[PDB]
Amino acid sequence: LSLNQLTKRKKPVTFARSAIHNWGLYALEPIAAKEMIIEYVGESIRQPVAEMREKRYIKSGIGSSYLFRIDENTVIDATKRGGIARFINHCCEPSCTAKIIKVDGRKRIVIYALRDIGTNEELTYDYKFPCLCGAPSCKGFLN
Amino acid sequence: PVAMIGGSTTRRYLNEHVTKHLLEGMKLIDPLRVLGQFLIDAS
Amino acid sequence: STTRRYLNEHVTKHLLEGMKLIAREKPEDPLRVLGQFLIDAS
Amino acid sequence: MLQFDKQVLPASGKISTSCQISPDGELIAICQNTDMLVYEISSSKMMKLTTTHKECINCLCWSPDSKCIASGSEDFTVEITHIIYGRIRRLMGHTAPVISICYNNKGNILCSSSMDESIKEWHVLSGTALKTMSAHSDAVVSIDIPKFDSSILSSGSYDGLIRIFDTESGHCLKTLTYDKDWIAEDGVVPISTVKFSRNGKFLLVKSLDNVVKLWEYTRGTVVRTFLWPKLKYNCGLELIYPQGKDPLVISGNDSGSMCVWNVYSKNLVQKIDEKHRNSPLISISASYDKVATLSLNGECNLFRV
Amino acid sequence: ANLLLQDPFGVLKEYPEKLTHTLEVPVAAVCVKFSPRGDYLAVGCSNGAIIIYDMDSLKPIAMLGTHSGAHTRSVQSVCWSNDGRYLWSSGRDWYAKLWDMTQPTKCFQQYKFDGPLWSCHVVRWNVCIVTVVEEPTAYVLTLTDRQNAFHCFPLLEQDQDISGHGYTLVACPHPTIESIIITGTSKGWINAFQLDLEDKIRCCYEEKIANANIKQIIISPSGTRIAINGSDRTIRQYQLIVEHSVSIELEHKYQDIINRLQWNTIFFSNHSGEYLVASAHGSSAHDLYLWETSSGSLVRVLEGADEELLDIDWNFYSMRIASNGFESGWVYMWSIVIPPKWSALAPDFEEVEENIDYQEKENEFDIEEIAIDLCTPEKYDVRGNDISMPSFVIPIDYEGVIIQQHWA
Amino acid sequence: SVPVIPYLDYDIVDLGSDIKKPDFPQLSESHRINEQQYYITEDTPLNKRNFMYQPCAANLMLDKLKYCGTDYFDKSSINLMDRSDKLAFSLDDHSVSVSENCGWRSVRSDVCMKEGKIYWEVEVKNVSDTSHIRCGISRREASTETPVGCDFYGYSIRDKGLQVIHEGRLHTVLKPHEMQAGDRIGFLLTLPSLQSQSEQAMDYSLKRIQELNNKFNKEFYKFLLRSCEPTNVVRDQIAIRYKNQLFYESTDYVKTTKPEYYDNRDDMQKFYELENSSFEVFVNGVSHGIAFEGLTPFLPPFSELQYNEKFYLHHEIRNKYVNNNRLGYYATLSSFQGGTASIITEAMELKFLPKDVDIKTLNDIYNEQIASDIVWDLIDEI
Numbered sequence A: 001l002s003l004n005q006l007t008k009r010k011k012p013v014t015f016a017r018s019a020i021h022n023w024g025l026y027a028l029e030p031i032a033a034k035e036m037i038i039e040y041v042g043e044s045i046r047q048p049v050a051e052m053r054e055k056r057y058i059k060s061g062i063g064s065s066y067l068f069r070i071d072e073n074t075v076i077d078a079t080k081r082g083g084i085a086r087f088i089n090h091c092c093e094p095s096c097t098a099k100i101i102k103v104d105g106r107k108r109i110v111i112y113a114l115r116d117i118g119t120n121e122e123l124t125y126d127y128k129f130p131c132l133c134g135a136p137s138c139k140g141f142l143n
Numbered sequence B: 001p002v003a004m005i006g007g008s009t010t011r012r013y014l015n016e017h018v019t020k021h022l023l024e025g026m027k028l029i030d031p032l033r034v035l036g037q038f039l040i041d042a043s
Numbered sequence C: 001s002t003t004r005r006y007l008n009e010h011v012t013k014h015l016l017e018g019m020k021l022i023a024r025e026k027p028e029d030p031l032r033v034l035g036q037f038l039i040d041a042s
Numbered sequence D: 001m002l003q004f005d006k007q008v009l010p011a012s013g014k015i016s017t018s019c020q021i022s023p024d025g026e027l028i029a030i031c032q033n034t035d036m037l038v039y040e041i042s043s044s045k046m047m048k049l050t051t052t053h054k055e056c057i058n059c060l061c062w063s064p065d066s067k068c069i070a071s072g073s074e075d076f077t078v079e080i081t082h083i084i085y086g087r088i089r090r091l092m093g094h095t096a097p098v099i100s101i102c103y104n105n106k107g108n109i110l111c112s113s114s115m116d117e118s119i120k121e122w123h124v125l126s127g128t129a130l131k132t133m134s135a136h137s138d139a140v141v142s143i144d145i146p147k148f149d150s151s152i153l154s155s156g157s158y159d160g161l162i163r164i165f166d167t168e169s170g171h172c173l174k175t176l177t178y179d180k181d182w183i184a185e186d187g188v189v190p191i192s193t194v195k196f197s198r199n200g201k202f203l204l205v206k207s208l209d210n211v212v213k214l215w216e217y218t219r220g221t222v223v224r225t226f227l228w229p230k231l232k233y234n235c236g237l238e239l240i241y242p243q244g245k246d247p248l249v250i251s252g253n254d255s256g257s258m259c260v261w262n263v264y265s266k267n268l269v270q271k272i273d274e275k276h277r278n279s280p281l282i283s284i285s286a287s288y289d290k291v292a293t294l295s296l297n298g299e300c301n302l303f304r305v
Numbered sequence E: 001a002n003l004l005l006q007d008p009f010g011v012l013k014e015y016p017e018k019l020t021h022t023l024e025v026p027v028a029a030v031c032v033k034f035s036p037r038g039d040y041l042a043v044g045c046s047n048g049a050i051i052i053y054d055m056d057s058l059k060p061i062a063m064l065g066t067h068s069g070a071h072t073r074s075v076q077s078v079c080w081s082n083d084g085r086y087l088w089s090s091g092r093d094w095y096a097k098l099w100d101m102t103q104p105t106k107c108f109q110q111y112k113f114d115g116p117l118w119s120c121h122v123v124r125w126n127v128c129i130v131t132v133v134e135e136p137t138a139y140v141l142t143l144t145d146r147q148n149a150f151h152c153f154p155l156l157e158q159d160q161d162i163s164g165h166g167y168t169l170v171a172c173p174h175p176t177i178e179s180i181i182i183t184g185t186s187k188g189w190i191n192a193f194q195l196d197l198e199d200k201i202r203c204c205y206e207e208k209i210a211n212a213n214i215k216q217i218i219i220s221p222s223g224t225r226i227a228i229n230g231s232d233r234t235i236r237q238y239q240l241i242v243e244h245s246v247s248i249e250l251e252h253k254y255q256d257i258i259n260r261l262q263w264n265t266i267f268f269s270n271h272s273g274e275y276l277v278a279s280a281h282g283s284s285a286h287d288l289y290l291w292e293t294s295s296g297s298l299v300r301v302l303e304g305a306d307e308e309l310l311d312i313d314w315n316f317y318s319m320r321i322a323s324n325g326f327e328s329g330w331v332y333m334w335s336i337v338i339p340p341k342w343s344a345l346a347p348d349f350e351e352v353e354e355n356i357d358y359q360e361k362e363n364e365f366d367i368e369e370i371a372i373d374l375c376t377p378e379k380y381d382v383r384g385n386d387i388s389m390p391s392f393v394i395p396i397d398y399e400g401v402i403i404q405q406h407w408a
Numbered sequence F: 001s002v003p004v005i006p007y008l009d010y011d012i013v014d015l016g017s018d019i020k021k022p023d024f025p026q027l028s029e030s031h032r033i034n035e036q037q038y039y040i041t042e043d044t045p046l047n048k049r050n051f052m053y054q055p056c057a058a059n060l061m062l063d064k065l066k067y068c069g070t071d072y073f074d075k076s077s078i079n080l081m082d083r084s085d086k087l088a089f090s091l092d093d094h095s096v097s098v099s100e101n102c103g104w105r106s107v108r109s110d111v112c113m114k115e116g117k118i119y120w121e122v123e124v125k126n127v128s129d130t131s132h133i134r135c136g137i138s139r140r141e142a143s144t145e146t147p148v149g150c151d152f153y154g155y156s157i158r159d160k161g162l163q164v165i166h167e168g169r170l171h172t173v174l175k176p177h178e179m180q181a182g183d184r185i186g187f188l189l190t191l192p193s194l195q196s197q198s199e200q201a202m203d204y205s206l207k208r209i210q211e212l213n214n215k216f217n218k219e220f221y222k223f224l225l226r227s228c229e230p231t232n233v234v235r236d237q238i239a240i241r242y243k244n245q246l247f248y249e250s251t252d253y254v255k256t257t258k259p260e261y262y263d264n265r266d267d268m269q270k271f272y273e274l275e276n277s278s279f280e281v282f283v284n285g286v287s288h289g290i291a292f293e294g295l296t297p298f299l300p301p302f303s304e305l306q307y308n309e310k311f312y313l314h315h316e317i318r319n320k321y322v323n324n325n326r327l328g329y330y331a332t333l334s335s336f337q338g339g340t341a342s343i344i345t346e347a348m349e350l351k352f353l354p355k356d357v358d359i360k361t362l363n364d365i366y367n368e369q370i371a372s373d374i375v376w377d378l379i380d381e382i
């Protein structure tokens, strides 16, 4: 319930070391219910250019995909240029989802919280394509 | 006509000239001679 | 499928070649030229 | 160039991991297995100070006022020891061996990196921990606070990374290299020793392939590289500043050989394969006009510009 | 210093915005003053104590006069010398105390006036201007090389007439002339004097700018601008010219006509004083106001504390604000808190706020002898403070810890 | 099972009328090159998600089927159905390009080159050093989003240096030449005849049915590969109305592994090549060499349709490996940042056409294609 402009200024989260994976996204204040945490920002690239990059990254041994898909034709690539939203790790019982708000004819990725989240808790969001998430009733496989 | 209602490329005129006669033939179909001749009879 | 099998075996091949002949250059009795074309096959 | 003045110890005995001259440049501190030896150079006397470390120790550092000596050991602890009044503090936070420590400019804070991949800030006067910067994926092997700006802090790790942290916030401010997650996973060169300039405008690192480069970390570029004409020990390195304006580097091999380059040029100007023949060099410390070298074995030699 | 050279895109944050630390002083703090560099903080207390906190730990490290010559009543001003070695002090016990941080235990030299003092502003480590309660003139207090005795002269021309000018409440030395002093009296009179550094002192300005008590005078550390706090709810800001001579030209006033509040203390930004900070007296006024000075607009409010705030100091090296509360006696602290930039985890990362439309290269689908100097110092940091001047370091009290070893 | 969509009033056209029932698309002004307007189509369904489209009209002569394919233009020209939505074109000279801020995009000719020898020329209009183009050839699997040649489904040549492009790699096999804003580049594409291409594919089928079958279900797939007639055409089309216009929606092919086979005689993996296939490029009549010889074949399992095997496997049946009369190599054109070029189709406007009687202008194979279309429209009725 906020203009995408307003989301750009307020910042309720930062990055820090995580038990799930190297770096993760944590909350600095009790964000709750279903409100706009942050937009997933990055390089807007076409579908085919995403395929070129994805292999070029695996070639260089990156082992991490910071590619978030908008729709079948464009994806946001935050591997090298992006926002701190690129630090959300995968879980099967997650605390966040992301929907597509469109402003001025352009699609944008907004991450909402699935449930109340306390301070110093890692924001978590299913990936929807291995697994290291710690949840008991969880998919053991990243896929 | 029924030709321009059915699209139109100049070299798609065949609809105006020979298509119905030919369609009229296949349904009949028996060597090709049955059609080869029937293709003459109409004209 | 039986009907399509019959047509494909014998007719279809030379029907296509005769059809694309009038398509490149057109006569004035296009029916008859084809009729000539098909007879010449068998 | 450097002549040879005085040998200071024989080779036999326990480990000798570290060696540093005091900021005032009169006393030389050498370490042994849970023992510590200060050596006044004016008189060539040697004093024995015993610490309560319960396992071998790996690093030393003088307090700026030249009256304490901080020591980090394999039993996960750090201890400030007053040369006169004995041990004064014992810190006890790390969960793994302490490999590198560095004092502050004012001597009130003491940073100590470890093999638990963390870098911990200690307030000396109250002996309590302030920060824990866990921003490495392998052993943090070396740290240094520049001599006249206590604002930044370097870190070298075996993960290949050279980070630069902010002392007040503890946040990473700049990295100059890549780790096992962003380049060819077999192409990382582990870092062994970081050390700033005297003005804090250039950062100097030593990789475990015996490559010594000089960085300008603000831009993130290397401006001088010094190559030897892999290792197993964090061989020692230091920047000598003779009164002659041209300064010098010096490094060490797993054989006790040392080269010294001119930094403005890149040409070698001297080499000392004579001493420390048996053991690897781990420590090289300097002072206004002196250089002190120390192999893994107790042999410690003094030189003079 | 250097850190601020790793964050700047040509610009830095020029004011702290977040309250970070609340020092719980054992006694009630009444005045705060950072050391020249942001190393230490002197906190004068209501009972006479002067705690000195180390700023890297927020913990006390000493307090002055505990064996000999502390203050018996509330200390009302503390002022470091430019070195950080000496510290001037003044309280309601009528004494002006000067301290040597090498011997924090005892007063280095002291002087008992004939009544309570208002404040004590240092001009040199040995020279300082004192202001006395219920006195028409200020006094200039000078030390002698035979260091037991003292000189104190009134800050008045030989036979100047000041009939009906009121009491001299506050003074303010010139930061960059070192010889000019501004004094504000009780009825709104502003004067300027010039010292010889004998006692033949001469006035250089006199203008009644208000019908109110001059509560405080402050000067932008570069002498370009000067502001005045008055008994009427208004701060007056001028442009200062000194050539001597002297000329003030009024730029802006400052009021909160809606809230109708007075200002306890005011302080300036670093060089030209582009920003102006102040503390409010009005009821429920628990925040610091900060204005621009070019256009006198309220730019921000510092919302950390929940009580009346009453002295302020602003160290431009550490970029921190100190202010003491009225009800709690504690010292509140605002700092610059920059979020961590993830762009600093690899050398080729870049953080961005809005998406970037990647421009596709034509190949998108196809397969050292630089001039070096390692020793010469940098005489300025990114903010322009004169680094490279000896600042004091209060040595570690080794002989105090070896007793604390036995549980104190 | 499913009925044909109804007729509607705007489909009916009687003799007195003169409106052209290939209802031309609505265009949008996209950009300008060299003082010429280039338009994009705004509300026609373009080929995507493995579906191809073709404007169809109401043919009352067919009662079972009610609609037959028709083509927009009089002669042969670009197929406005398989472009990128950002690849504009000019109706004045049929040149095509993308705005000067756009990446690589492609278009294919509307005529499918199946066999024989076919000649045509590319006329370049604007190729600066910021505006590149790539002339080449591609099968239906190539995506109009990418420049022709980045995959093994396309063969092309670059504008600067006349290098050769295939599988994304460059080669300098042709005589170097850098195109200027007025050249006319020739393309003679020789392919074996369908009968010789048919056994090369039946053999490929037969090798693959059991040799690699000694994926869980061998039986069903083997059935499919046996039941695979490459020459005979079985087409998949359904008439739909998209914004009051009339189109045929057909399934299309998908990218797959590059076909391989192990030859025990030479003891090595060999790729599949069309017998005697050649791709010769000319520059103003004078040949610069052969671009490629071993062109991949495309006839049946070489090109797999889009397939819901989850549905047919459950079970009257359709085939992956089927020809819909659109298998072959399309003269493809690609534009980058304002690179514009035109494609010629009719003999009368070829400046340097080689003198051989078996070769055919793109317009000829077009004409040969329409005839092949209406005949195949004929049989499907019965």
Ligand SMILES: C[S@@+](CC[C@H](N)C(=O)[O-])C[C@H]1O[C@@H](n2cnc3c(N)ncnc32)[C@H](O)[C@@H]1O
Binding pocket: A020, A021, A022, A023, A024, A063, A064, A065, A066, A086, A087, A088, A089, A090, A091, A130, A131, A132, A133
């Ligand atoms: C959005 S990034 C997460 C940020 C990552 N932690 C870092 O340090 O940059 C996604 C990448 O992290 C890895 N990853 C994310 N979640 C993971 C998990 N739960 N377990 C193991 N790897 C994970 C995946 O390989 C993926 O490519």
Ligand SMILES: [Zn+2]
Binding pocket: A090, A091, A092, A131, A132, A133, A134, A135, A138, A139, A140, A141
């Ligand atoms: Zn899981």
